[PDB]
Amino acid sequence: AVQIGFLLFPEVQQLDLTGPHDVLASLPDVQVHLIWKEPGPVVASSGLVLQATTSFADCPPLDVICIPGGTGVGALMEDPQALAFIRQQAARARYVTSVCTGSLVLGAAGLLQGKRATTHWAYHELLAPLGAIPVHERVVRDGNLLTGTGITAGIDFALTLAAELFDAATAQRVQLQLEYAPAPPFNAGSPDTAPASVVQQARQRAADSLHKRREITLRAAARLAA
Amino acid sequence: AVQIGFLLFPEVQQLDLTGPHDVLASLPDVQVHLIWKEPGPVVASSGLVLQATTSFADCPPLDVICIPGGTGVGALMEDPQALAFIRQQAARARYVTSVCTGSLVLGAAGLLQGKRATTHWAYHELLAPLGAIPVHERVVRDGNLLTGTGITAGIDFALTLAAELFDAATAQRVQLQLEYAPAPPFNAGSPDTAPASVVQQARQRAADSLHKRREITLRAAARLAA
C-alpha cells in the first residue's frame, strides 16, 4: 500500500489538507495518515476540529508527505520535533509536497536550499532567506519536491500524483467520479488579476502576520546557517 | 451575525462540506454550524473524523443551509428527523443549497418539487421521480435554491453567496486571500469531456450504488405522494 501522510497542526488551514486527503483517499491501495505529536483532536484556524491518527514515533515510512499551510505555520517553523520528523521522512519519500505557506515549513527544515519553490503571494519574500530560488508559478517542481499555491493546490497536484503513482486513466477516473471541474465566479485569485483596491485590502490585512513571520524566518535561517 | 449551517452525517463526502466551510468561515460576522442529531464525532466516508457542533433542537434559525453529498445520502433520504429539520430550516432560510448528491436529500424532503435542479452525473436520473426539473448544468438556481455539481461546487458557490450577502469586493478579497485559482491537470471532470473508456469504468463502479438508490428514491417518492 502507498503510504501518504499529512502534517496536522493547531491553526492549520484545514482545506489545504482536506482537499488532497479526499482525492488521494479515493485511490486503491493507499493508506492516508494525519500526523501530529500524538493522536487526538487538533483544531484548525476556523475552529473545525480534526483528529490526528498517528504520532511522529509511530508513523510508517511515507511515500508521500504533504505539509499544509495556515496561521499555525509560524509556530511550526520553530518546532524542532516537527522539523526533525519532516527531514527524516523527506529523506526517503518519493514525493515531498506542500500547499500555500506549508512551503515555509519545508524552508525552515532546510529542504528548500538551492531548490525552486513557491508559497502564498503575501509571504513570497520569505523564500529567499530560507535558501530557495523563488518562483511565481502556481505549481513548482524541483526533483521530488512539489510546492503549490492556493487553498486547493493539493486537489490539483493530487491528480498529478495519482497519474504518476498509478497511471493517467486512474487519475482521470478519480476526477470524473468526483465531477471535479471548477469554475470560479470571480477572477481575483492572484494579485495580478484582482483589482488594485482588493490587493491593497488583502495586503493590509496580512501586514501584522508578515511582520511576525519575518522575525521567525530570520531565526529559522540562523539555525540553518549553523 | 449571519448563521450558516452544514448537515454533517455519517459517510458524508467530507470535501463537499469542508470546502465551503473554510471559505464562508473567512467572512466577517458569520457563525458556521456543523449540525447532526447531537454534538460529537461523525465519520466521513474516507475515515476522516469530524465533530458536529450542535443538535437539531439547539440549532439557531439559519440564513444559509447547505446539504453535502456522499455515500451516506441513502440513509438520510429515509431519516424522518433529518428531513423534518431540513424542511423547517428551509422555510425561512435566505439560501437553501446542496453539493453533489446532497440534492437527493433536498428531493426526499420535498423541496425540489417543480424546481430546476442538478446532482452528480451518475445519479441524475433520480431527480425526476422526486419532482424536479432536471438540468445538466454545474450550478442551477431556482429562487432561493442553489444546487451544484462537483466535489468543490460549494467553494465556487460560496463566493457567489459572499457577494450577495456582503458585496463583490468582499468576495474578491476572500478569493485573493485564499489565492484560489484552480487549474486541473486533466479535463475528465464531466462525462462529456472524459474518454469513453473512463466513463465506462466510472459507471460500472457506481452501478450497485445506483441500483440501491433507485429503490430508496421510489420509497421517498411514495412518501411525497401521500
Q: Give the position of cell 493539493.
A: A154
**Rounded to 5 degrees, what are φ and ψ at A219?**
-65, -40
* Min Cα–Cα distance to chain B from A124, Å: 12
B103 alpha carbon, distance to own chain's centre = 6
Amino acid A150 reads: G
Resolution (A): 1.1
- Whether B194 sits inside 8 A of A172 (CB atoms) is yes
Of B138, B169, B195, the CB nearest to A198: B169
Which residues of B fall within a CB distance of 8 Å from A46?
21-22, 25-26, 32
Technique of determination? X-ray
Amino acid A135 reads: V
User: Which H or E run contains B20?
Assistant: helix B14-24
Give CA–CA dist A182/A65, Å, rounded: 25
Three-state SS for chain A is CEEEEEECCCCCCHHHHHHHHHHHCCCCCEEEEEEECCCEEEECCCCCEEEECEECCCCCCCCEEEECCCCCHHHHCCCHHHHHHHHHHHHHCCEEEEECCHHHHHHHCCCCCCCEECCCHHHHHHCHHHCCEECCCCEEEECCEEEECCCCHHHHHHHHHHHHHCCHHHHHHHHHHCCCCCCCCCCCCCCCCCCHHHHHHHHHHHHHHHHHHHHHHHHHHHHHHC
Please pick, among B7, B100, B151, B158, the residue that the annotation labels catalytic. Answer: B100
> Taking the domains of chain A in order of start, what are their residue ranges?
1-226
Please pick, among A7, A66, A100, A174, the residue that the annotation labels catalytic. Answer: A100
Of A23, A152, A201, the CB nearest to B173: A201
Contact B37, B9 (CB under 8 A): no
* Min Cα–Cα distance to chain A from B217, Å: 21
Exposure on the CB side of residue A164, measured as CA atoms within 13 A: 11
The residues near A47 (Cβ < 8 Å, ≥ 6 apart) are B25, B32
Beta-bridge partner residues of A105: none
Give CA–CA dist B213/B129, Å, rounded: 12
For B163, counting Cβ atoms within 10 Å of its Cβ (0-12 exposed, 13-18 middle, 19+ buried), the class is middle
Q: Give the position of cell 521567525.
A: A216
Q: Give the position of cell 524542532.
A: A80
**Rounded to 5 degrees, what are φ and ψ at B176?**
-70, -40
Distances in Å between the Cα of B92 and the Cα atoms of B3, B60, B166 are: 12, 12, 19
Distances in Å between the Cα of A182 and the Cα atoms of A174, B98, B101, B188 are: 15, 16, 17, 12
Strand B116-117 and strand B2-7: pairing? unpaired
Q: Let me know how long chain A is.
A: 226
Q: Closest by alpha carbon to A137, among A123, A149, A155, A128?
A: A149
Of A26, A150, A179, the CB nearest to B178: A150
Q: Is B34 helix (H, G, I), strand (E, B) or coil?
A: strand
- Whether B156 sits inside 8 A of A183 (CB atoms) is yes
